Design a protein around this ligand. Structure first.
Ligand SMILES: *[C@@H]1O[C@H](CO)[C@@H](O[C@@H]2O[C@H](CO)[C@@H](O)[C@H](O)[C@H]2NC(C)=O)[C@H](O)[C@H]1NC(C)=O
Ligand SMILES: *[C@@H]1O[C@H](CO)[C@@H](O[C@@H]2O[C@H](CO)[C@@H](O)[C@H](O)[C@H]2NC(C)=O)[C@H](O)[C@H]1NC(C)=O
Ligand SMILES: *[C@@H]1O[C@H](CO)[C@@H](O[C@@H]2O[C@H](CO)[C@@H](O)[C@H](O)[C@H]2NC(C)=O)[C@H](O)[C@H]1NC(C)=O
Ligand SMILES: *[C@@H]1O[C@H](CO)[C@@H](O[C@@H]2O[C@H](CO)[C@@H](O)[C@H](O)[C@H]2NC(C)=O)[C@H](O)[C@H]1NC(C)=O
Ligand SMILES: *[C@@H]1O[C@H](CO)[C@@H](O[C@@H]2O[C@H](CO)[C@@H](O)[C@H](O)[C@H]2NC(C)=O)[C@H](O)[C@H]1NC(C)=O
Ligand SMILES: *[C@@H]1O[C@H](CO)[C@@H](O)[C@H](O)[C@H]1NC(C)=O
Lengths: 170, 106, 50
């Protein structure tokens, strides 16, 4: 609040304008980064009420209705595990909207595979989608269909191990 | 990476201190519902599509390519056999045509 | 206002139904990428001292 200091500071020119402009550029760049990463779909996809995916369990990654934040158990664990003229500008996208974007991406990739990323979302059963992914890596569809229960059990076990590993590693 | 949709090709254009890429992509449109099955049960054998998918318009079963609707008769030439019908969940019963059958029939 | 992310689109998922495209659109999109800047040189002695 010193007037004499500001009068002497005016002798140095537009340094303050340069610093404010650089900080403003960084601040808008962070919002642009969040838009580029999370806002890649213009349709908010939602999962069906019945979670019949041929044995595949997505409860640890889909949003929890019981939680007020509408986050997944994994996302909730992630948020729990992260802890004089200065101002902090809030991000343009809040945490619930970012979670909503991730939920839309999860619903699109579960119910439609990769179709929603290239155009209209085309529904496909999840085992058939997994079989398509198996063909992508050079394994025949029959292998997926014959061992579907084993693949679903392995996927559920791995997702649970991911949650346990995140909860158990500082 | 090269536009929204399935990338077909791209064209470069010069710009002042920059480049403009015209990405030509293929976008699916006018989609239609069909009833689908993982495999076709015929003669105690499970048949799987070689490159396409089994679709049904309500009464008849066909095999088509995944990115465009082009229904074709389910034959031994576009399907492959792996195992019986007891293992695959959701296998449905349908006939599988044999192109060689009218040749020895005549 | 509170911004809207996108229009809601509930995909009609079921365990035995698929959606197959019957047509296509050849879509051309633009992507603009900067390549170079203006090449500026500053004579440090002449700038500071003339
Ligand atoms: C999907 O996985 C979730 C989580 O593993 C299962 O929920 C569990 O259900 C058992 C049995 O009722 C409970 O004892 C656990 O406490 C539940 N865990 C959680 C985190 O809620 C769920 O049953 C699985 N299956 C389906 C169809 O959702
Ligand atoms: C599903 O497609 C098949 C084949 O295009 C349809 O079968 C044809 O139906 C027409 C209409 O009566 C007949 O004139 C043809 O002779 C049929 N073809 C054969 C090979 O039988 C079938 O009707 C379609 N089903 C629905 C519900 O649209
Ligand atoms: C598909 O065909 C198979 C074999 O023709 C059917 O399986 C038979 O089902 C009857 C009735 O339950 C049993 O008595 C036979 O012993 C079964 N045979 C075999 C080899 O398993 C099957 O039910 C048919 N499915 C449909 C939907 O028509
Ligand atoms: C495929 O069938 C589904 C089920 O009927 C259609 O989904 C419904 O479409 C109507 C028409 O707008 C909506 O009012 C319903 O809410 C939709 N249901 C669900 C669960 O989303 C779907 O539109 C059909 N697809 C095509 C291409 O005809
Ligand atoms: C596929 O979509 C194209 C549009 O991209 C359709 O072409 C149009 O067909 C209508 C009806 O005859 C014409 O009035 C338009 O002028 C056509 N547009 C162009 C650019 O040619 C085409 O008919 C559709 N095909 C199917 C099978 O649905
Ligand atoms: C789909 O689910 C219904 C019950 O919701 C079941 O009767 C049917 O057999 C299932 N089909 C497949 C292919 O899993």
């Amino acid at each position: 609040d010193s007037t004499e200091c500001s009068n002497l500071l005016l002798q140095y020119g537009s340094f303050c304008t340069q610093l404010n402009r650089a900080l403003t550029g960084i601040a808008v760049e962070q919002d642009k980064n969040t838009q580029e990463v999370f806002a890649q779909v213009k349709q908010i996809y939602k999962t069906p009420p019945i979670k019949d995916f041929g044995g595949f369990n997505f409860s640890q990654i889909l949003p929890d209705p019981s939680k007020p934040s509408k986050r997944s158990p994994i996302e909730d664990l992630l948020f729990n595990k992260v802890t004089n003229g200065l101002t902090v500008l809030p991000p343009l996208l809040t945490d619930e909207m970012i979670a909503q974007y991730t939920s839309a991406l999860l619903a699109g990739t579960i119910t439609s595979g990769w179709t929603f990323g290239a155009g209209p979302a085309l529904q496909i059963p999840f085992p058939m989608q997994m079989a398509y992914r198996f063909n992508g890596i050079g394994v025949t569809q029959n292998v997926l269909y014959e061992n579907q229960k084993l693949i679903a059990n392995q996927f559920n076990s791995a997702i649970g191990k991911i949650q346990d590993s995140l909860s158990s590693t500082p | 990476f090269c536009g929204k949709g399935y990338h077909l090709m791209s064209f470069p254009q010069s710009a002042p201190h920059g480049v403009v890429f015209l990405h030509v992509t293929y976008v699916p449109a006018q989609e239609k519902n069909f009833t689908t099955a993982p495999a076709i049960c015929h003669d105690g054998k499970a048949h799987f599509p070689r490159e396409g998918v089994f679709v049904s318009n309500g009464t008849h079963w066909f095999v088509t390519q995944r990115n465009f609707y082009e229904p074709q008769i389910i034959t031994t030439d576009n399907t492959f056999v792996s195992g019986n019908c007891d293992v695959v969940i959701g296998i449905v019963n349908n006939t599988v045509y044999d192109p060689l059958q009218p040749e020895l029939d005549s | 206002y509170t911004m809207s992310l996108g229009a809601e689109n509930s995909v009609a998922y079921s365990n035995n139904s698929i959606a197959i495209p019957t047509n296509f659109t050849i879509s051309v999109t633009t992507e603009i990428l900067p390549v170079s800047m203006t090449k500026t040189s500053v004579d440090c002695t002449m700038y500071i001292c003339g």
